[PDB]
Swiss-Prot record, chain C:
Component of the 19S proteasome regulatory particle complex. The 26S proteasome consists of a 20S core particle (CP) and two 19S regulatory subunits (RP). The regulatory particle is made of a lid composed of 9 subunits including PSMD11, a base containing 6 ATPases and few additional components. Disulfide bonds: none annotated. Component of the 26S proteasome, a multiprotein complex involved in the ATP-dependent degradation of ubiquitinated proteins. This complex plays a key role in the maintenance of protein homeostasis by removing misfolded or damaged proteins, which could impair cellular functions, and by removing proteins whose functions are no longer required. Therefore, the proteasome participates in numerous cellular processes, including cell cycle progression, apoptosis, or DNA damage repair. In the complex, PSMD11 is required for proteasome assembly. It comes from Rattus norvegicus. It comes from the Eukaryota. The chain holds residues 160 to 317 of 422 of the full protein. Belongs to the proteasome subunit S9 family. Phosphorylated by AMPK. There is a cross-link at residue 115 (Glycyl lysine isopeptide (Lys-Gly) (interchain with G-Cter in SUMO2)). It is found in: Nucleus; Cytoplasm, Cytosol. This is 26S proteasome non-ATPase regulatory subunit 11. The lineage of its organism: Eukaryota, Metazoa, Chordata, Craniata, Vertebrata.
Swiss-Prot record, chain D:
The keyword Phosphoprotein applies. This is Proteasome subunit alpha type-6. Glycans are attached at residue 5. One of its GO terms (biological process) is proteasome-mediated ubiquitin-dependent protein catabolic process. The 26S proteasome consists of a 20S proteasome core and two 19S regulatory subunits. The 20S proteasome core is a barrel-shaped complex made of 28 subunits that are arranged in four stacked rings. The two outer rings are each formed by seven alpha subunits, and the two inner rings are formed by seven beta subunits. The proteolytic activity is exerted by three beta-subunits PSMB5, PSMB6 and PSMB7. Interacts with ALKBH4. SUPFAM superfamilies: N-terminal nucleophile aminohydrolases (Ntn hydrolases). The modification Phosphoserine is found at residues 17, 63-64. GO terms for molecular function: NF-kappaB binding; RNA binding. The gene is Psma6.
UniProtKB/Swiss-Prot annotation, chain F:
It is found in: Cytoplasm; Nucleus. CDD domains: proteasome_alpha_type_2. One of its GO terms (cellular component) is cytoplasm. The modification Phosphoserine is found at residues 7, 14, 16. Component of the 20S core proteasome complex involved in the proteolytic degradation of most intracellular proteins. This complex plays numerous essential roles within the cell by associating with different regulatory particles. Associated with two 19S regulatory particles, forms the 26S proteasome and thus participates in the ATP-dependent degradation of ubiquitinated proteins. Phosphorylated on tyrosine residues; which may be important for nuclear import. InterPro entries: Ntn_hydrolases_N, Proteasome_alpha, Proteasome_alpha-type, Proteasome_asu_N, Proteasome_sua/b. This is Proteasome subunit alpha type-2. Signal peptide: none annotated. Transmembrane segments: none annotated. NCBIfam families: PRK03996.1.
Swiss-Prot record, chain G:
It is found in: Cytoplasm. Belongs to the AAA ATPase family. Monoubiquitinated by RNF181. Phosphorylated. Dephosphorylated by UBLCP1 which impairs PSMC2 ATPase activity and disrupts 26S proteasome assembly. This is 26S proteasome regulatory subunit 7. The gene is Psmc2. It comes from Rattus norvegicus.
Length: 245, 50, 158, 246, 209, 234, 48, 302, 221, 304
């Protein structure tokens, strides 16, 4: 066994003989229970595409909270346990709030990701609070270093990506992103591209029935994180449907 | 047991010597050998203390 | 309740006197007490060499294990050479002596030669060497001759 | 089994095991082998050089954005080795400690003091009952403006020892042994020499040899009053030189 | 360090019966057989005396800690109690006591077993310079060793290695020579074999390097 | 239940009446580098095995005999983190002392104050003791001092003692060779021999550091200076 | 279950099987198993 | 003869007068005969690259005193009293041992020690004693006593009663082969896969002299196993072997066999003869689930 | 020949006569639970687990010819563990139905009649019988007892069945037996199975069934 | 490959090294024509360039270009040295297996032997170091590589170097060594041993192997030569026992047995020598069988 499900997770003050505590490995499993969130980076912004799992059609906007607004240039698309999803949103956001007051300028993503990553690992250390167990992405367009996309997993590892997907179909999705181009092209061409990857990856042993939500954070929306318009969403989706078939 | 052990141990050294009886030299050596070994086994607060 | 490295040294020197009379029992009893404090080094080179040299005399002639005698002698020489003069001389001849009884020439010749051997090697290296050849060859006559000529030095250390 | 013993409190709350070393601390070293980042740092007289795998698994990742070289002072730099989760948390912590100090002392930090100070902070994490020690190693590079280039390495628990040449990673024992021969037969140093020696020893131990967009070499040279990342342009030049060198 | 080897060498010399049992053989074979077996082994040696009783393992038998809330522990806690007794009954007669082998000195009890119930309680030197000199000299006797470094050099360099590590260095050095097709093995060969078995590099600690 | 919980804790008492924890801490120091300290009564010497082997250690600003203040040095064994905090606090306390009296602190008052601090971790629960045994040297008031402070948070007066690898054997040699009142130069020679018992793998060109404390004051010594004493007696 | 503890090893299963067959034969009945914490109860795979 | 009685051999004696009618040749348990004939592998017994380093270290122990005792005596060294191999489950302790043994061309009895499981010693003893006769009869010979751990051994401060009852079967075999004798012609190599139960008795030398770690396959080593395993299966050539090593970081050697088997099984569902980059990728994903559960990633030093 | 009962003379011990081989009626009754069929229409839940299982057992039994041609091993079998109640017996029955492979629902020591002597023989014979008549699927229930991860054994009929399993697994590696003889097992844990099983993947794809996911619940309804 | 030069690893190992080598081989026919004339710079550069691309086992691929190329280089004594230089540089630094480096170097040496005598001798030394680490495939090729020394060196004073190396390989045996190849090596070894006049070499090696291999019919041509060489060393030492077996072997040969003058002499040799040795087991069986044998009687000269 590379993990024990009772023994060495009785407290969050543990380590394990390999070097990594089992609670963190379980926290990657928590993200597997939910659907996929993809986010592909341009040089004019980031575009997210998350599939949102639905049980009813009485759902309206601000339901499930797959897209959060961390700042007025920082966007977040999430995947995994929605419960956990709210605290990670707070952690990134509070860091952003102090930053904005004091520094007085747009946040460079290179600093935010490491800074947040410290905090995500910091819950894991403590046994005052349990590790996190949702995974998120930060995608930003700024003049501070351009468009940049990071992914921070519940362990507290931060890495650069032009294309990251976190889910239960993250491995299958990431390979799929690498075959397509989106690296140098505008957010307007890209939106169409984020949608199709979600449909092609979309399996019936890793995901369930979904309504598409996509999001901007780039030059078209003038920095700020907004959800794509319904009209635009439906053209990006219309390509996504065609591309599967 | 330690006192029984000192007398017995003394007798064993004397045979080596080619004697049939103990001397002072053997009797005193026996005392030492039984007690230090006991004190080594029993103590374990002594590592660089007392 | 006391043993010390210096206390062992009196007993090492007592064993040596006993070996010269040709009595192993009283010496063997004494050897034990001496090696035990020795195991963990706590001593200058001179004590170490004495402990090595005595352990060797008892093991060589008396108990008759040549491999055991020699090994201690090699240490004793190296320790002896630094502080001492007369002592070192003895220990080198003794190295040759173990192997002469074993009756191999090969080891004797190798030992005669440079480890630090050349300086202390005196006329007696040749006495020890001439007797080895005499045992090997099976000539009694060769032996009598080496004893007579070399004798003063041979006699001095009992 | 493994080092330490489960019995009693030593993973529920941090109270010593029979070994006298915390259960978590002995486990803490094992955490480097989890990481897969194998580093060797070599010290010149003109620069301090660190060479590490940058760990870019695919070119889908951006090679620039992915990093493990951090700027933790005004020209002191470091590299991270070991479990990545531990590594970012240590970096950010080191950075706070770094800024405070720079102000107080009023000038840029000695490499020795910075490693000593992080080593004191990591003991804190060890000691506290909620927390657990860091599983990572920070290898600091920098040129002290008295002594010259210095390469330090801090251990997971917060052990400190001086180093003029160091290696850390999975294959820690092997990397330090290749570098040990090179330290003994010490070459005279220049920007190019020091860098060539660091890469060559790391490439023998692994026996693959690096790509010019998969390693990150970080230097603090006398010509820069900044901490500088070599990037793909510079590394590619040293790499083709290695094959030919000997 | 071949502590047991000494027990073998004397056992062979006697030319008499030797009854050699493990700790595992003392405990049950049909559940609850185990204490009965403890009485049997000792008496059997008396019928065929002179004889030697040897116990290789008492690693879980001479340990003070036991439960009965664990069913398994019950036979084991009896084997210890019977072993204390055997020593009492044996005394003021010609019956020699139990000769035993253990890894450490902290497994046995400090106030139920103590000297003058076992005449000699022998510790084998962990540092011992001379012991090692003797291990190298066996190699010398059989065929002469060539020197680049003295023999004294060989023992001087270690000074607290355990008995398992001396065995290892000698063994590996002869293995290297064999491949090479030497019949005289070098001094230097000994040095390299040794260097390899300093666990976690030549710098041992791996945090004060 | 069993002994496991009760005995280990320092949030509640060991059922033995003495804490199994401080004993654990001494084992740590055993796994450490070998360290000897001897008060000659002409000065104090602290010597330790320092891993160079090729000179892999900066000896220009980081050492194993390290000054707390002007005339006090420490040499250590065991856990490295525990010590670093201990050094920094110890120097801090010393500086408070130098500030007030205008004399650098003596070893005998310092160990007692230092002991109060180490006791707090041996009292606090969830907090483990400091796993370093310190050899404190000093020359203050015209008299050399050597003290031993163990991981429990207690201080003991010694004229000569041994720590680190095979401490039992060190203490036995020290009692045997050492005499009250000696010369500081003869004293280094027996200290290098004290290390040599359980060195491990033996000394290279220099794989020891020695620091001396005397009339002029505590100074760690340079690899060259250190090497001269090692030739005399290895 | 305790009332029949006729054993020769594996014999116990044949008894369980018989008690079940008899209940089945009587339609429109209820069978209540008393004292089946053993022989038809908990395994011991940690046993010794 | 009076040589038709020796300890452990079968005899027929008359019932009514208990005198020896005849010699009865000893039974050969079928279980021992299965162990001798069968090779549990499906991989090369020559080499597996990058595991090579380990294969050489084992060879030094076995081949060199056994083949030529001659060289060892002129050198002035003794034969080893054994070598112990370890690593997480399925690192191919058996496979490395098969490869050296086969090459030299020595008899092998490969034994899983769940066949010597018992309540108490009796029936298992005959199997043990027979393995000893087999090894002496077919000398030179190596008993792969695989899973010394399956058998009891480490009795901790306190273990179970059960551990001790089975533990006796190992103790008897070990002894018989080494340290009551100076020989290495009859030898046993022990494989461990579970660190938890490992005997203090073995650890102590003279039932040993070396400890050889058989490592988790290397960075380069996984690449080479993938190439030999792919070769029997229809393919057009893949470049995928480099992608599979990354994903398979920390998978033991046995797990790489699972990924080829599953990949072929995927090409087969599609109804294509050709195995392609994709079918091996799908396979790595499936094995990963079984990897965490089945094998350890945790480090064991002895 | 082995497995044949014989007459021994009572007065003087010699083998006088022969008697018919013993079989067990109890085993025959246990067999073929494929009717009614289970399919994937009243057994389900955990969409991924069901897919991997179909890949490991069901498809290689039909698609057997191909494996031989390609040269590549088929999957040796499937192992099921985890808390039960997902329908570990139904699952086994459904797969076996698809294939039209004979379905033995068996458990190792269960045919021991009266004494331990006579019963040893009966249980061993059953184990062998199930493996034979290839192609087949042997379903082993409650293998905690056969597993003997532990340091104690039952030393009755259980030992025999336990040994024959290990020998069998040693023999199975090939291309040819792997397809023909399939094994499916259900047990409560994964740590009370044979020490060999856990070593390596000696059965290709081993499936744990997680706690009910959102998709699993919806499907069971 | 992983964690060493990841990312486009699939490309670096497979794609680049295989293409670069293929591409220089395409460029070769130009080179070959230039190579005789000079163009020293042209051969070294082409080879090194290939190796520059990172992976494990760069050598093996690099082996294609050399197969045609080494032949032409050897005529000029300047060029072959450069060729081997390239191979050593990459290997030493990166540490390129046991196997990868050992195969390339041998092949360059194999070709040199045919072309002319002298360049091989110097290159043999260089290549012998590289092959040494192995235990399996490498070890076999290594032995065959040694074979070259045996013929060439016998003519010179170099016969002592040849003998030494060949004896070491042969003395320590693995089941990796093939029986067929083994016979050919030892036969050659005797002629070297005879030339030097070292009695010990023939005795020591013979114990390691079997005299029986030679006794066979397949071996029959080698057999006679092997014994002739062996008789003299032992015969000069004055050890009667060893020689007695060899004489018996010559007799066992059918060519020798068929002819009357020849069979008498061979058999004669065993009787006179064996009796000379002090009274033994070997003496008894031999003397009695020869007299009792019917062939002995036919000739009266021998009979007495």
């Amino acid at each position: 066994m590379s993990s024990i499900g009772t023994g060495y997770d009785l407290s969050a003050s543990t380590f394990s003989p390999d070097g990594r505590v089992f609670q963190v490995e379980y926290a990657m499993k928590a993200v597997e229970n939910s659907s996929t969130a993809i986010g592909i980076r341009c040089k004019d912004g980031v575009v997210f595409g998350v599939e949102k799992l639905v049980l009813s059609k009485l759902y309206e906007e601000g339901s499930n909270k797959r897209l959060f607004n961390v700042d007025r240039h920082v966007g977040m698309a999430v995947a995994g346990l929605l419960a956990d999803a709210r605290s990670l949103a707070d952690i990134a956001r509070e860091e952003a709030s102090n930053f904005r007051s004091n520094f007085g300028y747009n946040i460079p993503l290179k600093h935010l990701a490491d800074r947040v990553a410290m905090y995500v690992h910091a819950y894991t250390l403590y046994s005052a609070v349990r590790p996190f167990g949702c995974s998120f992405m930060l995608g930003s367009y700024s003049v501070n270093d351009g468009a940049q996309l990071y992914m921070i997993d519940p362990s507290g590892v931060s890495y650069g990506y032009w294309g990251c997907a976190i889910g239960k179909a993250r491995q299958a999705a990431k390979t799929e992103i690498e075959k397509l181009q989106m690296k140098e092209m505008t957010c307007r061409d890209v939106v169409k591209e984020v949608a199709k990857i979600i449909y092609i990856v979309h399996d019936e042993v890793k995901d369930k029935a979904f309504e598409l939500e996509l999001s901007w954070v780039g030059e078209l929306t003038k920095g700020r994180h907004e959800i794509v318009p319904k009209d635009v969403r439906e053209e990006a989706e219309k390509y996504a449907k065609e591309s599967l078939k | 047991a330690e006192v029984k052990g000192v007398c017995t141990e003394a007798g064993m050294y004397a045979l080596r010597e080619r004697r049939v009886h103990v001397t002072q030299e053997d009797f005193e050596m026996a005392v030492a050998k039984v007690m230090q070994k006991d004190s080594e086994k029993n103590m374990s607060i002594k590592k660089l203390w007392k | 309740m006391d043993d010390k490295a210096l206390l062992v040294e009196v007993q090492l020197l007592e064993s040596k006197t006993y070996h010269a009379l040709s009595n192993l029992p009283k010496a063997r009893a004494a050897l034990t007490s001496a090696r035990t404090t020795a195991n963990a080094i706590y001593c200058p080179p001179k004590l170490q060499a004495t402990l090595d040299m005595q352990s060797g005399i008892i093991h060589a002639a008396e108990e008759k294990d040549w491999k055991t005698a020699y090994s201690y002698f090699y240490e004793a020489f190296e320790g002896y050479d630094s502080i001492d003069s007369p002592k070192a001389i003895t220990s080198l001849k003794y190295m040759l002596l173990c192997k002469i009884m074993l009756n191999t020439p090969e080891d004797v010749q190798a030992l005669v030669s440079g480890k630090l051997a050349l300086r202390y090697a005196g006329r007696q290296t040749e006495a020890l060497k001439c007797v080895a050849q005499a045992s090997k060859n099976r000539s009694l006559a060769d032996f009598e001759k080496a004893l007579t000529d070399y004798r003063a030095e041979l006699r001095d250390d009992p | 089994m493994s080092r330490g013993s489960s019995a009693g409190f030593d993973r529920h709350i941090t109270i010593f095991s029979p070994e006298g070393r915390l259960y978590q601390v002995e486990y803490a070293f094992k955490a480097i082998n989890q990481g897969g980042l194998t580093s060797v740092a070599v010290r010149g007289k003109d620069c301090a050089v660190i060479v590490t795998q940058k760990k870019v698994p695919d070119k889908l990742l951006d090679s620039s954005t992915v990093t493990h070289l951090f700027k933790i002072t005004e020209n002191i730099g470091c590299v991270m080795t070991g479990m990545t989760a531990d590594s970012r948390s240590q970096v950010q912590r080191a950075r706070y400690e770094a800024a405070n100090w720079k102000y107080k002392y009023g000038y840029e930090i000695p490499v020795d003091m910075l490693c000593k100070r992080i080593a004191d902070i990591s003991q804190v994490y060890t000691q506290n009952a909620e927390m657990r020690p860091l599983g990572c190693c920070m290898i600091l590079i920098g040129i002290d403006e008295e002594q010259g280039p210095q390469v330090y390495k801090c251990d997971p628990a917060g052990y400190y020892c001086g180093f003029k040449a160091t290696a850390a990673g999975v294959k820690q024992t092997e990397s330090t042994s290749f570098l040990e021969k090179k330290v003994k037969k010490k070459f005279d140093w220049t920007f190019e020499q020091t860098v060539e020696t660091a890469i060559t020893c790391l490439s023998t131990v692994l026996s693959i040899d690096f790509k010019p967009s998969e390693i990150e070499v970080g230097v603090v040279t006398v010509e820069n009053p900044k901490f500088r990342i070599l990037t793909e342009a510079e590394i590619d030049a040293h790499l083709v030189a290695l094959a030919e060198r000997d | 360090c071949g502590k047991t080897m000494l027990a073998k060498a004397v056992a062979h010399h006697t030319t008499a019966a030797f009854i050699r049992v493990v700790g595992s053989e003392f405990v049950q074979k049909y559940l609850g057989e185990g204490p009965r077996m403890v009485r049997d082994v000792f008496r059997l040696a008396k019928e065929n005396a002179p004889a030697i009783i040897f116990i290789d393992e008492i690693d879980a038998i001479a340990t003070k800690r036991f439960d009965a809330q664990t069913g398994a522990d019950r036979e084991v806690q009896r084997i210890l109690l019977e072993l204390l007794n055997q020593m009492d009954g044996f005394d003021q007669n010609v019956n020699v006591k139990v000769i035993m082998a253990t890894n450490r000195a902290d497994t046995l009890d400090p106030a139920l077993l103590r000297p003058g119930r076992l005449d000699r309680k022998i510790e084998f030197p962990l540092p011992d310079r001379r012991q090692k000199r003797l291990i190298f000299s066996t190699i010398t006797s059989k065929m002469n060793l060539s020197e680049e470094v003295d023999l004294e050099d060989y023992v001087a360099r270690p000074d607290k290695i355990s008995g398992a590590d001396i065995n290892s260095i000698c063994q590996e050095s002869g293995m290297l020579a064999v491949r090479e097709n030497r019949y005289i093995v070098l001094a230097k060969d000994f040095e390299k074999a040794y260097k390899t078995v300093i666990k976690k590099d030549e710098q041992e600690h791996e945090f004060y390097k | 239940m069993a002994e496991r919980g009760y005995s280990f804790s320092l949030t509640t008492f060991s059922p033995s009446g003495k804490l199994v924890q401080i004993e654990y801490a001494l084992a740590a120091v055993a796994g450490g580098a070998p360290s000897v300290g001897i008060k000659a009564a002409n000065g104090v010497v602290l010597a330790t095995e320092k891993k160079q082997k090729s000179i892999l250690y900066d000896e220009r600003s980081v050492h194993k005999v390290e000054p707390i203040t002007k005339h006090i040095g420490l040499v250590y064994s065991g856990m490295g983190p525990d010590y670093r905090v201990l050094v920094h606090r110890a120097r801090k306390l010393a500086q408070q002392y130098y500030l007030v009296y205008q004399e650098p602190i003596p070893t005998a008052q310092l160990v007692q104050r230092v002991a109060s601090v180490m006791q707090e971790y041996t009292q606090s629960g969830g907090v483990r003791p400091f796993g370093v045994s310190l050899l404190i040297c000093g020359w203050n008031e015209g008299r050399p001092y050597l003290f031993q402070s163990d991981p429990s948070g207690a201080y003991f007066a010694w004229k000569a003692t041994a720590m680190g690898k095979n401490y039992v054997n060190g203490k036995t040699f020290l009692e045997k060779r050492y005499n009250e009142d000696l010369e500081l130069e003869d004293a280094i020679h027996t200290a290098i021999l004290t290390l040599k018992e359980s060195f491990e793998g033996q000394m290279t060109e220099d794989n020891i550091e020695v620091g001396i404390c005397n009339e002029a004051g505590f100074r760690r010594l340079t690899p060259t200076e250190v090497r001269d004493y090692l030739a005399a007696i290895a | 279950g305790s009332e029949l503890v006729q054993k020769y090893v594996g014999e116990g299963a044949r008894m369980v099987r018989e008690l079940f067959e008899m209940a089945r034969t009587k339609k429109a009945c209820l069978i209540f198993f008393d004292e089946i914490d053993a022989i038809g109860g908990a395994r011991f795979d940690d046993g010794a | 003869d009076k040589s038709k009685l020796k300890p452990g051999t079968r005899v027929a004696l008359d019932m009514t007068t208990l005198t020896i009618m005849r010699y009865l040749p000893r039974e050969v348990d079928p279980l021992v005969y299965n162990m001798s004939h069968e090779d549990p592998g499906n991989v090369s017994y020559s080499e597996i690259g990058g595991l090579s380093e380990q294969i050489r270290e084992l060879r030094e122990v076995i081949e060199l005193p056994l083949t030529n005792p001659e060289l060892f005596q002129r050198v002035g060294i003794i034969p080893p009293k054994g070598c112990l191999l370890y690593g997480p489950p399925g690192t191919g302790k058996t496979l490395l041992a098969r490869a050296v043994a086969s090459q030299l061309d020595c008899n092998f009895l490969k034994v899983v020690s769940s066949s010597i499981v018992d309540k108490y010693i009796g029936e298992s003893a005959r199997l043990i004693r027979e393995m000893f006769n087999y090894a002496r009869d077919h000398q030179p010979c190596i008993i792969f006593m695989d899973e010394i751990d399956a058998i009891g051994g480490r009795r901790f401060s306190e273990g179970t009663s059960a551990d001790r009852e089975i533990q006796r079967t190992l103790m008897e075999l070990l002894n018989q082969m080494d340290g009551f004798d100076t020989l290495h012609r009859v030898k046993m190599i022990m494989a461990t896969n579970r660190p938890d139960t490992l005997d203090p008795a073995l650890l102590r030398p003279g039932r040993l002299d070396r400890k050889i770690h058989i490592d988790l396959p290397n960075e380069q080593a996984r690449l080479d196993i993938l190439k030999i395993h792919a070769g029997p299966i229809t393919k057009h050539g893949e470049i995928d072997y480099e992608a599979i090593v990354k994903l398979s970081d920390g998978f033991n050697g046995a797990d790489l066999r699972n990924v080829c088997t599953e990949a072929g099984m995927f090409a087969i569902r599609a109804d294509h003869d050709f195995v392609v980059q994709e079918d091996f990728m799908k396979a790595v994903r499936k094995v990963a689930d079984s990897k965490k559960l089945e094998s350890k990633l945790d480090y064991k030093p002895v | 020949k082995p497995g044949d009962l014989v007459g021994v003379n009572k007065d003087s011990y010699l083998i006088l006569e022969t008697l018919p081989t013993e079989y067990d009626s109890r085993v025959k009754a246990m067999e073929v639970d494929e009717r009614p069929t289970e399919q994937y229409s009243d057994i389900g839940g955990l969409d991924k687990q069901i897919q991997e299982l179909v890949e490991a057992i069901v498809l290689p039994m039909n698609h057997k010819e191909k494996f031989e041609n390609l040269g590549i091993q088929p999957p040796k079998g499937v192992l099921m563990y985890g808390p039960p109640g997902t329908g570990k017996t139904l699952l086994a029955r459904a797969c076996a139905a698809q294939t039209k492979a004979t379905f033995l629902k068996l458990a190792g020591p269960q045919l021991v009649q009266m004494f331990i002597g006579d019963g040893a023989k009966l249980v061993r014979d059953a184990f062998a019988l199930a493996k034979e008549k290839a192609p087949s699927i042997i379903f082993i229930d409650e293998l905690d007892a056969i597993g003997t991860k532990r340091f104690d054994s039952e030393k009755a009929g259980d030992r025999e069945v336990q040994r024959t399993m290990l020998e069998l697994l040693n023999q199975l590696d090939g291309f040819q037996p792997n397809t023909q003889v399939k094994v499916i097992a259900a047990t409560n844990r994964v740590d009370i199975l044979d020490p060999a099983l856990l070593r390596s993947g000696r059965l290709d794809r081993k499936i744990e069934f997680p706690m009910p996911n959102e998709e699993a619940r919806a499907r069971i309804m | 490959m992983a964690d060493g030069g990841s990312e486009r690893a699939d490309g670096r190992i497979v794609k680049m090294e295989v293409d670069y080598s293929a591409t220089v081989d395409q460029r070769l026919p130009e080179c070959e024509k230039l190579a005789k004339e000079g163009r020293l710079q042209e051969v070294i550069e082409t080879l090194l360039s290939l190796e520059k691309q990172t992976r494990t086992a760069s050598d093996m691929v690099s082996t294609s270009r050399i197969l045609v190329a080494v032949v032409k280089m050897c005529y000029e004594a300047k060029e072959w040295d450069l060729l081997n230089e390239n191979i050593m540089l990459l290997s030493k630094r990166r540490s390129q297996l046991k196997q990868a480096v050992a195969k390339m170097v041998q092949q360059c040496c194999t070709y040199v032997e045919e072309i002319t005598d002298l360049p091989v001798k110097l290159r043999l030394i260089d290549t012998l170091r590289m092959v040494t680490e192995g235990k399996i495939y490498v070890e076999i090729e290594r032995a065959r590589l040694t074979k070259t020394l045996a013929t060439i060196k016998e003519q010179n004073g170099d016969v002592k170097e040849a003998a030494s190396i060949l004896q070491e390989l042969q003395v320590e045996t693995y089941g990796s060594m093939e029986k067929k190849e083994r016979v050919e090596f030892i036969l050659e070894q005797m002629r070297l041993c005879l030339a030097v006049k070292d009695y010990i070499r023939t005795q020591i090696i013979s114990k390691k192997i079997n005299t029986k291999f030679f006794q066979e019919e397949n071996t029959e041509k080698l057999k006679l030569k092997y014994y002739n060489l062996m008789i003299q060393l032992d015969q000069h030492e004055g050890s009667y026992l060893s020689i007695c077996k060899h004489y018996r072997a010559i007799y066992d040969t059918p060519c020798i047995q068929a002819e009357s003058d020849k069979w008498q002499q061979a058999l004669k040799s065993v009787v006179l020598y064996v009796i000379l040795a002090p009274f033994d087991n070997e003496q008894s069986d031999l003397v009695h069988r020869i007299s009792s044998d019917k062939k002995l009687e036919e000739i009266p000269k021998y009979k007495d």
